[PDB]
A paper describes a structure:
In order to develop such a system, three crystal structures of designed armadillo-repeat proteins with third-generation N-caps (YIII-type), four or five internal repeats (M-type) and second-generation C-caps (AII-type) were determined at 1.8 Å (His-YIIIM4AII), 2.0 Å (His-YIIIM5AII) and 1.95 Å (YIIIM5AII) resolution and compared with those of variants with third-generation C-caps. All constructs are full consensus designs in which the internal repeats have exactly the same sequence, and hence identical conformations of the internal repeats are expected.
The crystal structures of His-YIIIM4AII and His-YIIIM5AII were refined at 1.8 and 2.0 Å resolution, respectively. In both cases the asymmetric units contain tetramers with 222 point symmetry and very similar topologies. The quaternary structures of His-YIIIM4AII and His-YIIIM5AII are governed by calcium ions that connect neighbouring chains in a zipper-like manner and the His6 tag that binds to the supposed peptide-binding site, albeit in different orientations (see below). These differences are caused by different contacts within the tetramer. In His-YIIIM5AII these differences are combined into a single structure. His-YIIIM5AII chains A/B and C/D represent the conformations seen in His-YIIIM4AII (all chains) and YIIIM5AII (all chains), respectively.
Residue numbers in the entry: 4 to 292
Amino acid sequence: HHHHHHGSELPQMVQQLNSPDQQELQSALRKLSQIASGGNEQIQAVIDAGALPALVQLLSSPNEQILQEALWTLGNIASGGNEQIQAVIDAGALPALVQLLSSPNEQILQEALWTLGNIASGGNEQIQAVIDAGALPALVQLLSSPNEQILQEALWTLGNIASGGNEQIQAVIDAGALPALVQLLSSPNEQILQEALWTLGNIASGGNEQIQAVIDAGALPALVQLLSSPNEQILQEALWTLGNIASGGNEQKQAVKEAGALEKLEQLQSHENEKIQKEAQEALEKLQA
Ligand SMILES: [Ca+2]
Ligand SMILES: [Ca+2]
Ligand SMILES: [Ca+2]
Ligand SMILES: [Ca+2]
């Protein structure tokens, strides 16, 4: 695409977000979307022309075509810099997004989850905003969803929250994530297993309190069993997750040994796949530190 020195064209587009001509409205919405799918400089032009408050307000539209595109514009803006994410938060996006997590329209629901995930990919300030807006309860509930597509989205958003500081991880734990995540570890669906492990491993990246909650919820037997998975990605993920657990205190280390991990970690050091050899030796190092 093409360079454009954004002048009064943008502000006029933002104003047409109010147009009673839904054709003119949609047209402007699409152009704002396209611009926000560019780099940070383009994203910044959209923010600086005042688009955010009107986009956020469109999240209460009863017109799904408008709503879905505004959500998409917001999600793109939130895929930029932390200060861009923070502009979306300041404009009031979070409560409207959290509301949408109860939508029975799976397209809107996915898009809200996606937008939330992008906001939660920012710094700990952005993550804390998501927690404070009350997103956790809905996210945790979606862990029991029979909808694999919604489930993966929810898992990615929770995983993002769980990659923050220890208190942010602890909020995820306090909202009850762990039992549903532990149960996912018995899924026959390896794609789900991979996604659940990404999220659980982040939780296990916390401090000893957070690690002990993982052990308390029953994670270890399921993890240890996945060290025999024939899928090598899963095998990698479970090593990574166990290593994180292993890096805690003596109490945490002892739990890992009691669950039988030590012997498995040792054999996997010789695995054919180098990525596994490396994850295994690094998990063993953590345990044995
Ligand atoms: Ca409608
Ligand atoms: Ca539906
Ligand atoms: Ca299904
Ligand atoms: Ca399977």
